[PDB]
Design a protein around this ligand. Structure first.
Ligand SMILES: OC[C@H]1O[C@H](O[C@H]2[C@H](O)[C@@H](O)[C@@H](O)O[C@@H]2CO)[C@H](O)[C@@H](O)[C@@H]1O
Length: 581
Protein backbone atom coordinates (compact mmCIF):
# COMPACT_ATOMS: atom_id res chain seq x y z
CA UNK A 1 0.00 0.00 0.00
CA UNK A 2 0.89 3.71 -0.28
CA UNK A 3 1.12 4.36 3.45
CA UNK A 4 3.30 1.65 4.94
CA UNK A 5 6.64 0.35 3.69
CA UNK A 6 7.97 -3.19 3.65
CA UNK A 7 11.49 -4.04 2.50
CA UNK A 8 12.72 -7.63 1.91
CA UNK A 9 16.35 -8.07 2.84
CA UNK A 10 18.23 -11.08 4.09
CA UNK A 11 18.67 -11.99 7.69
CA UNK A 12 22.37 -11.63 7.55
CA UNK A 13 22.65 -7.98 6.42
CA UNK A 14 22.17 -4.65 8.16
CA UNK A 15 18.41 -5.03 8.48
CA UNK A 16 18.77 -3.32 11.85
CA UNK A 17 20.32 -0.36 10.10
CA UNK A 18 17.46 -0.49 7.61
CA UNK A 19 14.86 -0.10 10.33
CA UNK A 20 16.85 2.94 11.53
CA UNK A 21 16.61 4.73 8.19
CA UNK A 22 12.92 3.89 8.33
CA UNK A 23 12.57 6.11 11.41
CA UNK A 24 14.78 8.81 9.92
CA UNK A 25 12.05 8.63 7.24
CA UNK A 26 8.72 8.46 9.09
CA UNK A 27 9.92 11.12 11.52
CA UNK A 28 10.63 13.33 8.48
CA UNK A 29 8.04 12.75 5.76
CA UNK A 30 4.98 10.91 7.07
CA UNK A 31 5.81 7.51 5.57
CA UNK A 32 6.60 4.76 8.08
CA UNK A 33 9.26 2.28 6.99
CA UNK A 34 9.26 -0.97 8.98
CA UNK A 35 11.72 -3.51 7.56
CA UNK A 36 11.38 -7.30 7.25
CA UNK A 37 13.76 -10.24 6.80
CA UNK A 38 11.90 -13.23 5.30
CA UNK A 39 13.29 -16.74 4.94
CA UNK A 40 13.96 -18.05 1.40
CA UNK A 41 13.08 -14.55 0.18
CA UNK A 42 14.84 -15.15 -3.14
CA UNK A 43 12.73 -18.23 -3.99
CA UNK A 44 9.35 -16.92 -2.83
CA UNK A 45 9.74 -13.61 -4.72
CA UNK A 46 9.01 -15.63 -7.88
CA UNK A 47 5.81 -17.31 -6.67
CA UNK A 48 4.28 -14.14 -5.10
CA UNK A 49 5.22 -11.49 -7.69
CA UNK A 50 3.38 -13.79 -10.09
CA UNK A 51 0.40 -12.89 -7.82
CA UNK A 52 1.03 -9.14 -7.76
CA UNK A 53 2.24 -9.31 -4.14
CA UNK A 54 5.69 -8.51 -2.82
CA UNK A 55 7.58 -6.05 -0.62
CA UNK A 56 8.06 -2.57 -2.00
CA UNK A 57 11.80 -3.16 -2.72
CA UNK A 58 13.68 -6.52 -2.90
CA UNK A 59 17.34 -6.85 -1.85
CA UNK A 60 19.64 -9.62 -3.04
CA UNK A 61 22.86 -10.24 -4.83
CA UNK A 62 22.38 -9.12 -8.44
CA UNK A 63 22.54 -12.72 -9.78
CA UNK A 64 18.91 -13.71 -9.12
CA UNK A 65 17.43 -10.32 -10.17
CA UNK A 66 18.13 -11.08 -13.80
CA UNK A 67 15.74 -13.95 -13.58
CA UNK A 68 13.30 -11.29 -12.36
CA UNK A 69 13.50 -9.78 -15.84
CA UNK A 70 12.71 -13.11 -17.54
CA UNK A 71 9.38 -13.00 -15.71
CA UNK A 72 8.99 -9.18 -15.58
CA UNK A 73 8.94 -9.16 -11.77
CA UNK A 74 11.21 -6.09 -11.55
CA UNK A 75 10.59 -2.53 -12.69
CA UNK A 76 12.84 -0.39 -14.86
CA UNK A 77 14.80 2.34 -13.04
CA UNK A 78 16.37 5.71 -14.05
CA UNK A 79 18.28 8.37 -12.04
CA UNK A 80 20.12 11.57 -13.05
CA UNK A 81 23.77 12.26 -13.90
CA UNK A 82 24.64 13.98 -10.60
CA UNK A 83 23.65 10.62 -9.11
CA UNK A 84 25.00 8.08 -11.59
CA UNK A 85 28.21 10.02 -10.95
CA UNK A 86 27.57 9.62 -7.17
CA UNK A 87 28.15 5.89 -7.38
CA UNK A 88 30.64 3.76 -9.44
CA UNK A 89 29.59 2.89 -13.04
CA UNK A 90 30.70 -0.75 -12.95
CA UNK A 91 27.95 -1.52 -10.38
CA UNK A 92 25.49 0.17 -12.66
CA UNK A 93 26.82 -2.49 -15.03
CA UNK A 94 25.79 -5.32 -12.65
CA UNK A 95 22.05 -4.46 -12.71
CA UNK A 96 21.96 -3.68 -16.43
CA UNK A 97 20.07 -6.38 -18.34
CA UNK A 98 19.04 -5.86 -21.96
CA UNK A 99 19.76 -2.17 -21.48
CA UNK A 100 16.87 -1.76 -19.05
CA UNK A 101 18.62 -1.08 -15.80
CA UNK A 102 16.58 -3.13 -13.39
CA UNK A 103 17.86 -2.28 -9.83
CA UNK A 104 19.97 -0.13 -7.47
CA UNK A 105 23.63 -0.99 -6.66
CA UNK A 106 23.98 -0.67 -2.91
CA UNK A 107 27.33 -2.43 -2.23
CA UNK A 108 29.79 -5.11 -3.35
CA UNK A 109 30.22 -8.28 -1.31
CA UNK A 110 33.11 -10.75 -1.32
CA UNK A 111 34.19 -13.74 0.75
CA UNK A 112 37.42 -12.85 2.66
CA UNK A 113 39.46 -15.30 4.82
CA UNK A 114 39.27 -14.65 8.59
CA UNK A 115 41.85 -16.19 11.00
CA UNK A 116 42.93 -15.80 14.66
CA UNK A 117 45.96 -13.57 15.29
CA UNK A 118 46.20 -14.80 18.88
CA UNK A 119 46.73 -18.33 17.52
CA UNK A 120 48.40 -17.71 14.16
CA UNK A 121 51.45 -15.46 13.52
CA UNK A 122 50.67 -15.46 9.78
CA UNK A 123 47.97 -17.43 7.93
CA UNK A 124 48.70 -19.99 5.19
CA UNK A 125 48.60 -18.09 1.95
CA UNK A 126 48.44 -21.46 0.10
CA UNK A 127 45.61 -23.94 0.53
CA UNK A 128 47.91 -26.97 0.78
CA UNK A 129 49.66 -25.41 3.83
CA UNK A 130 46.48 -25.88 5.86
CA UNK A 131 46.33 -29.68 6.46
CA UNK A 132 49.78 -29.35 8.00
CA UNK A 133 48.25 -26.82 10.42
CA UNK A 134 45.15 -28.77 11.48
CA UNK A 135 47.21 -31.76 12.63
CA UNK A 136 49.30 -29.23 14.57
CA UNK A 137 46.27 -27.50 16.13
CA UNK A 138 44.86 -31.06 16.58
CA UNK A 139 47.16 -31.05 19.56
CA UNK A 140 46.56 -27.58 21.03
CA UNK A 141 42.88 -28.42 21.58
CA UNK A 142 41.59 -26.34 18.64
CA UNK A 143 40.71 -26.75 14.91
CA UNK A 144 41.96 -25.09 11.71
CA UNK A 145 39.02 -23.96 9.53
CA UNK A 146 35.20 -23.86 9.45
CA UNK A 147 32.81 -22.01 7.13
CA UNK A 148 29.39 -22.67 5.63
CA UNK A 149 29.83 -26.03 3.92
CA UNK A 150 26.14 -25.89 2.90
CA UNK A 151 25.70 -22.95 0.53
CA UNK A 152 28.01 -23.35 -2.51
CA UNK A 153 28.86 -19.63 -2.41
CA UNK A 154 31.52 -20.46 0.23
CA UNK A 155 33.18 -23.39 -1.53
CA UNK A 156 33.15 -21.69 -4.95
CA UNK A 157 36.47 -19.79 -4.44
CA UNK A 158 38.40 -23.04 -3.91
CA UNK A 159 36.67 -24.85 -6.80
CA UNK A 160 37.38 -21.90 -9.04
CA UNK A 161 41.09 -21.33 -8.36
CA UNK A 162 42.45 -24.06 -10.69
CA UNK A 163 39.75 -23.15 -13.19
CA UNK A 164 36.20 -24.14 -12.40
CA UNK A 165 33.74 -21.66 -13.87
CA UNK A 166 30.01 -21.10 -14.25
CA UNK A 167 29.58 -19.96 -17.87
CA UNK A 168 32.26 -19.01 -20.34
CA UNK A 169 31.88 -15.49 -21.67
CA UNK A 170 32.75 -15.35 -25.36
CA UNK A 171 32.76 -12.16 -27.47
CA UNK A 172 29.60 -10.70 -25.96
CA UNK A 173 27.57 -13.51 -24.40
CA UNK A 174 27.93 -16.30 -21.88
CA UNK A 175 27.80 -19.69 -23.59
CA UNK A 176 25.14 -21.73 -21.77
CA UNK A 177 26.57 -24.83 -23.48
CA UNK A 178 30.00 -24.05 -22.03
CA UNK A 179 29.66 -24.65 -18.32
CA UNK A 180 32.92 -25.18 -16.45
CA UNK A 181 31.87 -27.09 -13.32
CA UNK A 182 32.92 -30.59 -14.31
CA UNK A 183 36.21 -29.36 -15.82
CA UNK A 184 39.66 -30.29 -14.46
CA UNK A 185 40.49 -27.64 -11.82
CA UNK A 186 36.90 -27.80 -10.63
CA UNK A 187 37.60 -31.42 -9.63
CA UNK A 188 40.88 -30.29 -8.03
CA UNK A 189 39.17 -27.84 -5.64
CA UNK A 190 36.23 -30.06 -4.76
CA UNK A 191 38.54 -33.04 -4.17
CA UNK A 192 40.87 -30.91 -2.06
CA UNK A 193 37.96 -29.85 0.17
CA UNK A 194 36.58 -33.39 0.60
CA UNK A 195 39.88 -34.47 2.13
CA UNK A 196 39.90 -31.80 4.80
CA UNK A 197 36.56 -32.77 6.35
CA UNK A 198 37.62 -36.37 5.72
CA UNK A 199 40.78 -35.93 7.73
CA UNK A 200 38.67 -34.28 10.47
CA UNK A 201 40.10 -30.88 9.63
CA UNK A 202 36.51 -29.68 9.02
CA UNK A 203 33.04 -31.25 9.32
CA UNK A 204 30.66 -31.86 6.40
CA UNK A 205 27.74 -30.76 8.62
CA UNK A 206 29.01 -27.21 9.20
CA UNK A 207 26.38 -24.64 8.13
CA UNK A 208 26.24 -20.88 8.51
CA UNK A 209 25.28 -20.52 12.18
CA UNK A 210 27.60 -23.31 13.36
CA UNK A 211 30.70 -21.83 11.70
CA UNK A 212 29.78 -18.34 12.89
CA UNK A 213 29.36 -19.91 16.33
CA UNK A 214 32.64 -21.85 16.07
CA UNK A 215 35.09 -19.11 15.03
CA UNK A 216 33.63 -16.51 17.46
CA UNK A 217 33.53 -18.75 20.51
CA UNK A 218 37.01 -19.49 19.20
CA UNK A 219 37.38 -23.26 18.93
CA UNK A 220 38.43 -23.33 15.29
CA UNK A 221 41.35 -21.25 14.01
CA UNK A 222 39.79 -19.73 10.86
CA UNK A 223 36.55 -19.02 8.97
CA UNK A 224 35.42 -17.39 5.71
CA UNK A 225 32.58 -14.93 5.22
CA UNK A 226 31.25 -11.73 3.76
CA UNK A 227 31.54 -8.38 5.49
CA UNK A 228 28.00 -8.75 6.90
CA UNK A 229 29.57 -11.18 9.38
CA UNK A 230 32.33 -9.08 10.97
CA UNK A 231 29.41 -7.60 12.93
CA UNK A 232 28.96 -10.60 15.24
CA UNK A 233 32.76 -10.94 15.45
CA UNK A 234 33.06 -7.25 16.24
CA UNK A 235 30.32 -8.12 18.71
CA UNK A 236 32.21 -11.04 20.26
CA UNK A 237 35.87 -10.65 21.28
CA UNK A 238 38.15 -12.57 18.86
CA UNK A 239 41.27 -10.93 17.42
CA UNK A 240 41.35 -11.62 13.69
CA UNK A 241 42.90 -10.71 10.42
CA UNK A 242 40.91 -10.36 7.22
CA UNK A 243 43.14 -11.54 4.40
CA UNK A 244 43.23 -12.82 0.86
CA UNK A 245 42.04 -16.41 0.76
CA UNK A 246 44.85 -18.96 0.43
CA UNK A 247 46.12 -19.82 -3.02
CA UNK A 248 45.13 -23.34 -4.03
CA UNK A 249 47.73 -24.71 -6.50
CA UNK A 250 49.56 -21.39 -6.73
CA UNK A 251 46.54 -19.67 -8.15
CA UNK A 252 44.44 -17.28 -6.01
CA UNK A 253 41.00 -18.12 -4.79
CA UNK A 254 38.31 -16.46 -6.91
CA UNK A 255 35.09 -15.60 -5.13
CA UNK A 256 31.94 -14.85 -7.06
CA UNK A 257 31.46 -11.18 -6.46
CA UNK A 258 27.93 -10.14 -5.56
CA UNK A 259 26.45 -6.71 -5.99
CA UNK A 260 23.86 -6.14 -3.27
CA UNK A 261 21.10 -4.67 -5.37
CA UNK A 262 17.62 -3.21 -4.83
CA UNK A 263 15.04 -4.09 -7.48
CA UNK A 264 11.46 -2.73 -7.39
CA UNK A 265 8.26 -4.80 -7.49
CA UNK A 266 6.59 -5.55 -10.87
CA UNK A 267 2.95 -4.62 -10.26
CA UNK A 268 3.76 -1.90 -7.73
CA UNK A 269 1.99 1.50 -7.78
CA UNK A 270 4.50 2.39 -5.01
CA UNK A 271 7.22 2.69 -7.69
CA UNK A 272 7.33 6.45 -6.96
CA UNK A 273 7.86 6.15 -3.19
CA UNK A 274 10.44 3.38 -3.78
CA UNK A 275 13.08 5.38 -5.68
CA UNK A 276 12.97 8.07 -3.00
CA UNK A 277 13.96 6.23 0.18
CA UNK A 278 16.75 4.41 -1.71
CA UNK A 279 18.57 7.54 -2.94
CA UNK A 280 18.08 10.28 -0.30
CA UNK A 281 18.29 8.68 3.13
CA UNK A 282 19.99 5.31 2.53
CA UNK A 283 22.31 5.62 -0.49
CA UNK A 284 24.15 8.49 1.20
CA UNK A 285 26.52 8.83 4.15
CA UNK A 286 23.91 9.20 6.92
CA UNK A 287 22.05 6.14 5.67
CA UNK A 288 24.97 3.92 4.86
CA UNK A 289 26.54 4.45 8.28
CA UNK A 290 23.41 3.06 9.96
CA UNK A 291 23.33 -0.09 7.84
CA UNK A 292 27.14 -0.42 8.24
CA UNK A 293 27.39 0.14 11.95
CA UNK A 294 25.14 -2.96 12.04
CA UNK A 295 26.30 -5.46 9.41
CA UNK A 296 29.16 -4.14 7.29
CA UNK A 297 28.42 -4.05 3.59
CA UNK A 298 32.15 -4.13 2.77
CA UNK A 299 32.63 -1.63 -0.05
CA UNK A 300 29.55 0.55 -0.41
CA UNK A 301 28.83 1.64 -3.97
CA UNK A 302 28.62 5.28 -2.85
CA UNK A 303 31.83 7.14 -3.69
CA UNK A 304 31.51 9.38 -0.64
CA UNK A 305 31.26 6.50 1.81
CA UNK A 306 33.47 4.01 -0.07
CA UNK A 307 36.29 6.53 0.22
CA UNK A 308 35.68 6.79 3.95
CA UNK A 309 35.71 3.11 4.97
CA UNK A 310 38.45 2.51 2.41
CA UNK A 311 41.16 3.07 5.02
CA UNK A 312 39.57 0.02 6.78
CA UNK A 313 42.12 -2.76 6.15
CA UNK A 314 39.36 -5.37 6.24
CA UNK A 315 37.69 -3.70 3.25
CA UNK A 316 40.97 -3.11 1.39
CA UNK A 317 41.43 -6.90 1.66
CA UNK A 318 37.83 -7.56 0.76
CA UNK A 319 38.60 -5.82 -2.49
CA UNK A 320 41.92 -7.67 -2.92
CA UNK A 321 39.65 -10.74 -2.92
CA UNK A 322 36.87 -9.39 -5.09
CA UNK A 323 39.28 -8.46 -7.94
CA UNK A 324 40.83 -11.92 -7.93
CA UNK A 325 37.26 -13.18 -8.28
CA UNK A 326 34.63 -12.46 -10.90
CA UNK A 327 31.46 -10.47 -10.72
CA UNK A 328 28.72 -13.07 -11.23
CA UNK A 329 26.39 -13.36 -14.19
CA UNK A 330 22.85 -12.10 -13.63
CA UNK A 331 21.39 -14.38 -16.33
CA UNK A 332 18.42 -16.46 -15.09
CA UNK A 333 20.33 -19.74 -15.67
CA UNK A 334 22.47 -18.88 -12.60
CA UNK A 335 19.83 -20.19 -10.19
CA UNK A 336 19.83 -23.61 -11.84
CA UNK A 337 23.63 -23.48 -11.78
CA UNK A 338 23.92 -22.69 -8.08
CA UNK A 339 21.53 -25.40 -6.99
CA UNK A 340 23.33 -27.87 -9.26
CA UNK A 341 26.60 -26.95 -7.53
CA UNK A 342 24.97 -26.78 -4.06
CA UNK A 343 24.04 -30.48 -4.39
CA UNK A 344 27.55 -31.61 -5.20
CA UNK A 345 29.42 -30.11 -2.28
CA UNK A 346 26.65 -31.42 -0.02
CA UNK A 347 26.93 -34.82 -1.71
CA UNK A 348 30.76 -34.84 -1.70
CA UNK A 349 31.82 -33.74 1.80
CA UNK A 350 29.14 -36.06 3.13
CA UNK A 351 30.00 -39.10 1.03
CA UNK A 352 26.80 -40.00 -0.87
CA UNK A 353 28.86 -39.40 -4.05
CA UNK A 354 32.43 -39.18 -5.39
CA UNK A 355 33.83 -35.84 -6.55
CA UNK A 356 33.68 -36.79 -10.23
CA UNK A 357 30.20 -38.36 -10.28
CA UNK A 358 28.80 -35.33 -8.45
CA UNK A 359 30.35 -32.69 -10.72
CA UNK A 360 29.14 -34.47 -13.85
CA UNK A 361 25.56 -34.42 -12.66
CA UNK A 362 26.10 -30.80 -11.67
CA UNK A 363 27.37 -29.91 -15.13
CA UNK A 364 24.52 -31.63 -16.98
CA UNK A 365 22.03 -29.85 -14.72
CA UNK A 366 23.68 -26.50 -15.32
CA UNK A 367 23.93 -26.67 -19.09
CA UNK A 368 20.24 -27.51 -19.54
CA UNK A 369 18.08 -28.55 -16.56
CA UNK A 370 17.26 -24.95 -15.74
CA UNK A 371 14.32 -25.91 -13.53
CA UNK A 372 14.92 -25.46 -9.82
CA UNK A 373 12.09 -28.01 -9.46
CA UNK A 374 13.00 -30.79 -11.91
CA UNK A 375 16.30 -31.20 -10.08
CA UNK A 376 14.54 -32.31 -6.88
CA UNK A 377 12.24 -34.68 -8.81
CA UNK A 378 15.45 -36.35 -10.02
CA UNK A 379 16.89 -36.92 -6.54
CA UNK A 380 13.65 -38.47 -5.39
CA UNK A 381 13.37 -40.74 -8.42
CA UNK A 382 16.79 -42.03 -7.42
CA UNK A 383 15.62 -42.63 -3.84
CA UNK A 384 12.47 -44.51 -4.83
CA UNK A 385 14.53 -46.44 -7.42
CA UNK A 386 16.59 -47.46 -4.37
CA UNK A 387 13.80 -47.48 -1.82
CA UNK A 388 11.85 -49.82 -4.10
CA UNK A 389 15.14 -51.67 -4.45
CA UNK A 390 15.85 -52.08 -0.72
CA UNK A 391 12.25 -53.20 -0.23
CA UNK A 392 12.23 -56.60 -1.95
CA UNK A 393 15.62 -57.09 -0.28
CA UNK A 394 14.66 -56.45 3.38
CA UNK A 395 10.97 -57.26 3.88
CA UNK A 396 8.87 -59.16 6.33
CA UNK A 397 11.31 -57.33 8.64
CA UNK A 398 11.22 -54.63 11.25
CA UNK A 399 11.96 -52.22 8.38
CA UNK A 400 9.10 -52.90 5.97
CA UNK A 401 6.83 -50.19 7.36
CA UNK A 402 9.47 -47.42 7.48
CA UNK A 403 10.41 -48.39 3.92
CA UNK A 404 6.90 -48.40 2.46
CA UNK A 405 5.88 -45.15 4.14
CA UNK A 406 9.01 -43.46 2.80
CA UNK A 407 8.21 -44.78 -0.66
CA UNK A 408 4.75 -43.23 -0.25
CA UNK A 409 6.49 -40.08 1.04
CA UNK A 410 8.98 -39.90 -1.88
CA UNK A 411 5.92 -39.94 -4.11
CA UNK A 412 3.90 -37.39 -2.05
CA UNK A 413 6.67 -34.80 -2.17
CA UNK A 414 7.09 -35.28 -5.91
CA UNK A 415 3.59 -34.10 -6.83
CA UNK A 416 3.79 -31.30 -4.24
CA UNK A 417 5.98 -29.42 -6.76
CA UNK A 418 4.48 -30.82 -10.02
CA UNK A 419 0.87 -30.78 -11.19
CA UNK A 420 -0.38 -30.89 -7.56
CA UNK A 421 0.83 -27.49 -6.25
CA UNK A 422 -1.76 -27.91 -3.48
CA UNK A 423 1.15 -28.52 -1.12
CA UNK A 424 -0.20 -29.29 2.31
CA UNK A 425 3.53 -28.53 2.95
CA UNK A 426 5.24 -25.17 3.48
CA UNK A 427 7.94 -24.11 1.03
CA UNK A 428 10.87 -23.56 3.41
CA UNK A 429 10.46 -27.19 4.46
CA UNK A 430 10.50 -28.81 1.00
CA UNK A 431 14.28 -29.09 0.66
CA UNK A 432 14.66 -30.10 4.30
CA UNK A 433 12.08 -32.90 3.86
CA UNK A 434 13.86 -34.16 0.76
CA UNK A 435 17.38 -34.07 2.20
CA UNK A 436 15.96 -35.85 5.25
CA UNK A 437 14.82 -38.67 2.96
CA UNK A 438 18.53 -39.17 2.21
CA UNK A 439 18.96 -39.36 6.01
CA UNK A 440 16.16 -41.96 6.27
CA UNK A 441 17.72 -44.08 3.54
CA UNK A 442 21.17 -44.10 5.15
CA UNK A 443 19.55 -45.20 8.47
CA UNK A 444 17.73 -48.04 6.76
CA UNK A 445 21.13 -48.82 5.29
CA UNK A 446 23.01 -48.58 8.60
CA UNK A 447 20.47 -50.72 10.40
CA UNK A 448 20.44 -53.55 7.87
CA UNK A 449 24.21 -53.95 7.72
CA UNK A 450 25.18 -53.72 11.41
CA UNK A 451 22.19 -54.50 13.65
CA UNK A 452 21.09 -57.75 12.09
CA UNK A 453 23.59 -59.51 14.37
CA UNK A 454 21.85 -58.39 17.60
CA UNK A 455 18.82 -58.93 19.85
CA UNK A 456 15.69 -57.87 17.98
CA UNK A 457 15.03 -54.85 20.20
CA UNK A 458 18.08 -53.13 18.62
CA UNK A 459 16.26 -53.62 15.33
CA UNK A 460 12.94 -52.74 16.97
CA UNK A 461 14.01 -49.24 18.04
CA UNK A 462 15.51 -48.24 14.68
CA UNK A 463 12.48 -49.69 12.93
CA UNK A 464 10.31 -47.34 14.96
CA UNK A 465 12.76 -44.44 14.77
CA UNK A 466 12.86 -44.41 10.98
CA UNK A 467 9.05 -44.44 10.87
CA UNK A 468 9.09 -41.52 13.30
CA UNK A 469 11.32 -39.72 10.81
CA UNK A 470 9.23 -40.37 7.68
CA UNK A 471 6.24 -39.12 9.74
CA UNK A 472 7.87 -35.79 10.58
CA UNK A 473 9.09 -35.79 6.98
CA UNK A 474 5.39 -35.98 5.95
CA UNK A 475 3.95 -33.79 8.73
CA UNK A 476 2.88 -30.30 7.52
CA UNK A 477 3.04 -29.32 11.16
CA UNK A 478 6.75 -30.08 11.56
CA UNK A 479 8.86 -26.99 10.80
CA UNK A 480 12.37 -27.09 9.32
CA UNK A 481 13.87 -27.29 12.83
CA UNK A 482 11.20 -29.73 14.01
CA UNK A 483 12.54 -32.04 11.31
CA UNK A 484 16.30 -31.50 11.66
CA UNK A 485 16.02 -32.27 15.37
CA UNK A 486 14.15 -35.47 14.51
CA UNK A 487 16.88 -36.36 12.00
CA UNK A 488 19.56 -36.03 14.70
CA UNK A 489 17.60 -38.41 16.93
CA UNK A 490 17.72 -41.21 14.36
CA UNK A 491 21.47 -40.60 14.19
CA UNK A 492 21.47 -40.63 18.00
CA UNK A 493 19.49 -43.88 18.07
CA UNK A 494 22.13 -45.67 15.96
CA UNK A 495 24.64 -45.38 18.79
CA UNK A 496 22.13 -46.37 21.45
CA UNK A 497 21.28 -49.67 19.77
CA UNK A 498 24.90 -50.81 19.36
CA UNK A 499 25.03 -51.05 23.19
CA UNK A 500 22.63 -53.98 23.14
CA UNK A 501 23.87 -57.52 23.64
CA UNK A 502 24.81 -59.20 20.42
CA UNK A 503 22.72 -62.26 19.87
CA UNK A 504 23.81 -65.41 21.65
CA UNK A 505 24.46 -68.73 19.87
CA UNK A 506 21.91 -70.39 22.14
CA UNK A 507 19.16 -67.78 21.74
CA UNK A 508 16.10 -68.17 19.53
CA UNK A 509 17.49 -66.94 16.22
CA UNK A 510 16.11 -63.61 15.02
CA UNK A 511 14.52 -63.11 11.60
CA UNK A 512 17.74 -61.36 10.63
CA UNK A 513 19.89 -64.40 11.36
CA UNK A 514 17.25 -66.42 9.51
CA UNK A 515 17.59 -63.81 6.77
CA UNK A 516 21.12 -65.09 6.43
CA UNK A 517 20.35 -68.79 5.92
CA UNK A 518 17.74 -67.74 3.36
CA UNK A 519 20.32 -65.88 1.26
CA UNK A 520 22.40 -69.07 1.13
CA UNK A 521 19.33 -71.02 -0.01
CA UNK A 522 18.81 -68.56 -2.86
CA UNK A 523 22.54 -68.59 -3.69
CA UNK A 524 22.66 -72.39 -3.71
CA UNK A 525 19.62 -72.81 -5.95
CA UNK A 526 20.98 -70.20 -8.37
CA UNK A 527 24.40 -71.84 -8.39
CA UNK A 528 22.68 -75.24 -8.68
CA UNK A 529 20.53 -74.30 -11.66
CA UNK A 530 23.55 -72.64 -13.31
CA UNK A 531 26.46 -75.03 -12.66
CA UNK A 532 24.70 -78.35 -11.79
CA UNK A 533 21.22 -78.69 -13.33
CA UNK A 534 21.99 -80.39 -16.61
CA UNK A 535 25.69 -80.14 -15.97
CA UNK A 536 26.51 -83.00 -13.66
CA UNK A 537 24.75 -86.32 -13.47
CA UNK A 538 21.50 -86.65 -11.56
CA UNK A 539 22.61 -88.93 -8.70
CA UNK A 540 24.45 -85.87 -7.32
CA UNK A 541 21.58 -83.49 -8.10
CA UNK A 542 19.32 -85.56 -5.83
CA UNK A 543 21.73 -85.50 -2.87
CA UNK A 544 22.05 -81.73 -3.11
CA UNK A 545 18.32 -81.06 -3.52
CA UNK A 546 17.86 -82.79 -0.16
CA UNK A 547 20.30 -80.39 1.53
CA UNK A 548 18.06 -77.58 0.31
CA UNK A 549 14.85 -79.12 1.68
CA UNK A 550 16.83 -79.76 4.84
CA UNK A 551 18.16 -76.22 4.92
CA UNK A 552 14.64 -74.89 4.40
CA UNK A 553 13.42 -77.04 7.28
CA UNK A 554 15.88 -75.27 9.52
CA UNK A 555 14.32 -71.86 8.88
CA UNK A 556 10.67 -73.02 8.99
CA UNK A 557 11.46 -74.10 12.55
CA UNK A 558 10.63 -71.27 14.96
CA UNK A 559 12.69 -72.76 17.80
CA UNK A 560 15.92 -72.76 15.82
CA UNK A 561 18.85 -71.37 17.76
CA UNK A 562 21.52 -69.17 16.20
CA UNK A 563 23.97 -72.04 16.48
CA UNK A 564 21.50 -74.40 14.77
CA UNK A 565 21.41 -71.98 11.84
CA UNK A 566 25.14 -71.14 11.70
CA UNK A 567 26.10 -74.79 11.15
CA UNK A 568 23.26 -75.32 8.67
CA UNK A 569 24.74 -72.75 6.28
CA UNK A 570 28.12 -74.49 6.61
CA UNK A 571 26.26 -77.51 5.24
CA UNK A 572 25.24 -75.83 1.98
CA UNK A 573 28.56 -74.19 1.22
CA UNK A 574 30.01 -77.63 1.77
CA UNK A 575 27.12 -79.51 0.09
CA UNK A 576 27.06 -77.22 -2.92
CA UNK A 577 30.79 -77.92 -2.98
CA UNK A 578 30.09 -81.64 -2.49
CA UNK A 579 28.15 -81.31 -5.78
CA UNK A 580 31.14 -79.87 -7.61
CA UNK A 581 32.65 -83.00 -9.13
O1 LIG B 1 25.28 -20.34 -2.45
C1 LIG B 1 24.19 -20.31 -3.35
C2 LIG B 1 23.61 -18.91 -3.38
O2 LIG B 1 24.74 -18.07 -3.44
C3 LIG B 1 24.55 -16.67 -3.53
O3 LIG B 1 24.01 -16.21 -2.33
C4 LIG B 1 24.87 -15.57 -1.43
C5 LIG B 1 24.50 -14.11 -1.60
O4 LIG B 1 25.11 -13.66 -2.78
C6 LIG B 1 24.87 -13.21 -0.40
O5 LIG B 1 23.96 -12.11 -0.39
C7 LIG B 1 24.80 -13.90 0.97
O6 LIG B 1 23.45 -13.91 1.38
O7 LIG B 1 25.33 -15.21 0.93
C8 LIG B 1 24.62 -16.03 0.00
C9 LIG B 1 24.95 -17.52 0.14
O8 LIG B 1 25.17 -17.86 1.48
C10 LIG B 1 23.64 -16.34 -4.71
O9 LIG B 1 23.37 -14.95 -4.61
C11 LIG B 1 22.39 -17.25 -4.75
O10 LIG B 1 21.66 -17.13 -5.96
C12 LIG B 1 22.73 -18.72 -4.60
O11 LIG B 1 21.56 -19.55 -4.58
Amino acid sequence: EEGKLVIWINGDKGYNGLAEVGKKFEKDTGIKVTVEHPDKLEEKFPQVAATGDGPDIIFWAHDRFGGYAQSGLLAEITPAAAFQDKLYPFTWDAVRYNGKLIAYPIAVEALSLIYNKDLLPNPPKTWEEIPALDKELKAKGKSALMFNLQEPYFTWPLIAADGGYAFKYAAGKYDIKDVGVDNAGAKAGLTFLVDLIKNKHMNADTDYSIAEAAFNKGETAMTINGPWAWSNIDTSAVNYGVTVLPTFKGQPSKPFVGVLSAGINAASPNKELAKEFLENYLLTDEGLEAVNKDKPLGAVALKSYEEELAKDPRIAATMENAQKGEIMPNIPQMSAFWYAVRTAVINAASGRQTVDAALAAAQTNAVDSNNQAQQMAQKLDQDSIQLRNIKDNVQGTDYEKPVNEAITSVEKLKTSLRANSETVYDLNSIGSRVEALTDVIEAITFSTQHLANKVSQANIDMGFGITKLVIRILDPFASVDSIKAQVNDVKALEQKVLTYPDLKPTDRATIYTKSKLDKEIWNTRFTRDKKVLNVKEFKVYNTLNKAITHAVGVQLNPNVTVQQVDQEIVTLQAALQTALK
